[PDB]
Amino acid sequence: SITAITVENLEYPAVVTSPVTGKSYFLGGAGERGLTIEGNFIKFTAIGVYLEDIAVASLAAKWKGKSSEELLETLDFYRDIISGPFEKLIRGSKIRELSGPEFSRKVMENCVAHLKSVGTYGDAEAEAMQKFAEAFKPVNFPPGASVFYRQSPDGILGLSFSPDTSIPEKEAALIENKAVSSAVLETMIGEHAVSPDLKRCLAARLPALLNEGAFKI
Numbered sequence: 192s193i194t195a196i197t198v199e200n201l202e203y204p205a206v207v208t209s210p211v212t213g214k215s216y217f218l219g220g221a222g223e224r225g226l227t228i229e230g231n232f233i234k235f236t237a238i239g240v241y242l243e244d245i246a247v248a249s250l251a252a253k254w255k256g257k258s259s260e261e262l263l264e265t266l267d268f269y270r271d272i273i274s275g276p277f278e279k280l281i282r283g284s285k286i287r288e289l290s291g292p293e294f295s296r297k298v299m300e301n302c303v304a305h306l307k308s309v310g311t312y313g314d315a316e317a318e319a320m321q322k323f324a325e326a327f328k329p330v331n332f333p334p335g336a337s338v339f340y341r342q343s344p345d346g347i348l349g350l351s352f353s354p355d356t357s358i359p360e361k362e363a364a365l366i367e368n369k370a371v372s373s374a375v376l377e378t379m380i381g382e383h384a385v386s387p388d389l390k391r392c393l394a395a396r397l398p399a400l401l402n403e404g405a406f407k408i
């Protein structure tokens with residue numbers, strides 16, 4: 192019942208299965224991110240957000256029987272996606288070649304931004320971020336190079352890099368800090384995430400599922 196999304200010739204499948212935790216996610220929504228200089232928006236990377244199947248049953252708890260327009264203006268609904276008792280997978284596939292650090296910089300930027308936004312950015316979180324950046328250093332992402340973030344409900348972030356848009360088998364690293372976990376996703380679909388790219392998508396495709404209250408295969 193669920194379909195795919197190509198964002199600037201970078202395709203995001205309808206479903207996916209982690210070689211790491213054998214879970215199976217569904218494309219919640221795709222989108223793209225980039226920079227705005229001189230009123231021009233140059234897109235650098237595509238972005239798709241995946242939710243584990245067990246997410247429908249969970250969100251159905253309070254979001255079923257509501258429509259796109261309705262959820263889209265509801266913040267809680269997102270705090271629920273980002274902090275849901277389930278794994279979320281976020282895949283960023285480059286549109287413009289960026290190095291590990293060049294990129295890991297903008298990302299780490301909005302993160303700490305939020306961490307302080309809610310008084311969670313302390314020593315531990317700080318080390319976790321150091322680590323976060325130590326992971327991206329050896330890397331580089333020419334177009335098609337994907338980064339895979341696994342946000343585990345157990346308060347862990349699974350970092351894994353690729354030269355193309357196919358998920359790797361093993362992971363680059365694991366950042367074990369509950370805060371830093373949600374961070375990424377929060378910076379993309381959170382309250383303070385200006386772009387309605389991911390938000391509109393999620394708001395549009397989930398009710399279709401939420402009406403059945405289940406998911407698997």
Ligand SMILES: O=C1C[C@@H](c2ccc(O)cc2)Oc2cc(O)ccc21
Nearest residue numbers: 224225235236293294297298301378
């Ligand atoms: O998916 C991206 C792209 C990234 C980025 C854009 C332009 C650039 O030059 C380097 C990195 O910024 C981000 C910041 C975030 O908090 C979350 C996701 C992203």
